[PDB]
Each structure stands twice: as C-alpha cells, then as structure tokens.
Enzyme design. Sequence first.
Site, PDB file in Angstrom:
ATOM      1  N   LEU A 180      -3.378   2.768  15.605  1.00 16.48           N
ATOM      2  CA  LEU A 180      -4.593   2.808  15.333  1.00 16.48           C
ATOM      3  C   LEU A 180      -5.486   2.110  15.856  1.00 16.48           C
ATOM      4  CD1 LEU A 180      -3.834   3.101  11.397  1.00 16.48           C
ATOM      5  CD2 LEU A 180      -5.298   4.875  12.422  1.00 16.48           C
ATOM      6  N   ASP A 200      -6.960  10.261  -0.889  1.00 15.08           N
ATOM      7  CA  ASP A 200      -6.035   9.480  -0.876  1.00 15.08           C
ATOM      8  C   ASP A 200      -5.567   8.960   0.637  1.00 15.08           C
ATOM      9  OD1 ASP A 200      -2.746   9.359  -0.509  1.00 15.08           O
ATOM     10  OD2 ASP A 200      -3.310   8.002  -2.019  1.00 15.08           O
ATOM     11  N   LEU A 201      -5.584   9.852   1.464  1.00 15.08           N
ATOM     12  CA  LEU A 201      -5.178   9.353   2.725  1.00 15.08           C
ATOM     13  C   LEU A 201      -6.037   8.638   3.457  1.00 15.08           C
ATOM     14  CD1 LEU A 201      -3.678  12.821   4.242  1.00 15.08           C
ATOM     15  CD2 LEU A 201      -2.594  10.849   3.082  1.00 15.08           C
ATOM     16  N   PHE A 256      -5.984   5.016   2.351  1.00 13.32           N
ATOM     17  CA  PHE A 256      -4.924   4.336   3.130  1.00 13.32           C
ATOM     18  C   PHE A 256      -5.287   3.877   4.329  1.00 13.32           C
ATOM     19  CE2 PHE A 256      -1.735   4.636   6.806  1.00 13.32           C
ATOM     20  CZ  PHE A 256      -1.100   3.521   6.477  1.00 13.32           C
ATOM     21  N   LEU A 271       0.859  -1.316  -0.047  1.00  7.58           N
ATOM     22  CA  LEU A 271       0.049   0.154   0.153  1.00  7.58           C
ATOM     23  C   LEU A 271       0.768   1.213   0.046  1.00  7.58           C
ATOM     24  CD1 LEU A 271      -2.713   1.102   0.031  1.00  7.58           C
ATOM     25  CD2 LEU A 271      -2.963   0.856   2.426  1.00  7.58           C
ATOM     26  N   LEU A 282       4.217  12.226   3.285  1.00  7.02           N
ATOM     27  CA  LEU A 282       3.600  12.502   2.021  1.00  7.02           C
ATOM     28  C   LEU A 282       3.543  13.946   1.803  1.00  7.02           C
ATOM     29  CD1 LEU A 282       1.048   9.609   2.318  1.00  7.02           C
ATOM     30  CD2 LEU A 282       2.048  10.072  -0.042  1.00  7.02           C
ATOM     31  N   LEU A 287      -1.846  -9.121   5.474  1.00  4.94           N
ATOM     32  CA  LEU A 287      -0.648  -8.316   5.879  1.00  4.94           C
ATOM     33  C   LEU A 287      -0.427  -7.220   4.675  1.00  4.94           C
ATOM     34  CD1 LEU A 287       1.943  -8.809   8.191  1.00  4.94           C
ATOM     35  CD2 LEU A 287       3.054  -8.661   5.855  1.00  4.94           C
ATOM     36  N   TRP A 316       2.265  15.927  -0.436  1.00  5.29           N
ATOM     37  CA  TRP A 316       0.982  16.303  -1.021  1.00  5.29           C
ATOM     38  C   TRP A 316      -0.285  15.775  -0.038  1.00  5.29           C
ATOM     39  CZ3 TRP A 316       3.868  12.682  -4.028  1.00  5.29           C
ATOM     40  CH2 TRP A 316       3.493  11.245  -3.607  1.00  5.29           C
ATOM     41  N   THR A 339      -1.118   4.299  -5.910  1.00  2.15           N
ATOM     42  CA  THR A 339      -2.288   5.443  -6.095  1.00  2.15           C
ATOM     43  C   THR A 339      -1.366   6.654  -6.959  1.00  2.15           C
ATOM     44  OG1 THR A 339      -3.312   5.132  -4.174  1.00  2.15           O
ATOM     45  CG2 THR A 339      -3.435   7.444  -4.910  1.00  2.15           C
TER      46      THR A 339
END
Length: 162
Positions: A54, A26-27, A30, A4, A19, A94, A21, A116
């Site tokens: 997370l 897009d974030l 992910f 990813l 990143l 994974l 940008w 991406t």
Amino acid sequence: TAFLWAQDRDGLIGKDGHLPWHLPDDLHYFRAQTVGKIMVVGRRTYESFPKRPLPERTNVVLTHQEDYQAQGAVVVHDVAAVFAYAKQHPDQELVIAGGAQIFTAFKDDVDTLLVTRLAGSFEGDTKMIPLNWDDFTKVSSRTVEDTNPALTHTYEVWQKKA
Ligand SMILES: COc1cc(Cc2c[nH+]c(N)nc2N)cc(OC)c1OC
C-alpha cells in the site's frame, strides 16, 4: 497493538483467509484504518491481500518460518521483533491485519480490538480464533446500514482493561 478484522454473525472470517463476502464498504474501512499507520499481515494474508504493498503506509509480512519471504511488506519471523518494531515508531500505531494465527500470537498483548459484524452470514473453511469478550470492555461502536441486510455491518472497538 491494534486488531483489525471483519467477521459474520456466526463467527467465520472467510475461506483460505480471503474475505468471501464482497462489502466494498467494510473493505474501505480496513484500507482507511491502515493509512498512515503500521500494519502486520500474516503469510496467508500476503496471498489473500488484493494488492500490495500500500502507498504511504507501512506494511509488514509476518511468518512462522524464516524460509518464507514477502514483497512490499517487511518480513519478520520474530514475535518479539514485531513488538519492538512498533515500539520504535511510537508515532505510528501497530495494527494486526491477520491472519488468525498472527492474531493469536499477539492477541494476549493487544490494547485495542476492532471488529466488523455483518447481519448476513457466509460459509467458509476458515473461522476466527476465539476471543475473550469479557476480558475486554467495548469503548465505542458505529452502525452502518447497507441496501441489503447481509451487506449491512457495524463497527465495534474494544479496549483491554486490567
Ligand atoms: C481490502 O480487501 C481485504 C481486506 C482485508 C483486511 C480487512 C478487511 N476488513 C476488515 N474489517 N478488517 C480487515 N483487516 C482482508 C481481505 O482478505 C483477507 C481483503 O480482501 C478480500
């Protein structure tokens, strides 16, 4: 194992791993992909990440040297150990969150690749490691258009064939 990552048209990932940008879209992608699935992040990633760990997810911090330690993500310094960990949890896939050094280490033994692409371009001191596109054949992809062309991005998934 799954890959990813997000990259610009030129082929750069960003600067210092982070990143450059700001594409909330897009974030979001992910973050959504890493929900309910096992993900592995390099040491540079640990510092590049916005906020860890997370919730309702399994994050792992992988580093070359065992001197380094990480909070919120399991720390593994063994390449073989990372594979075995994923093997232990067949129910959960994974995914390699990065970095490129981490990607390179497990790039050879990856069955699913997620990339991406942004129409716009960004400049940074960090570039994504070379990949063998010919070796892998794209299975499916999705295109999303943002307000700004640079912001607009597409999602492509490649599966290794042998
Ligand atoms: C959620 O924010 C970030 C997310 C990611 C991971 C990431 C993002 N986007 C994509 N397409 N793949 C990824 N693995 C890397 C970052 O920096 C390295 C982030 O912060 C800018």
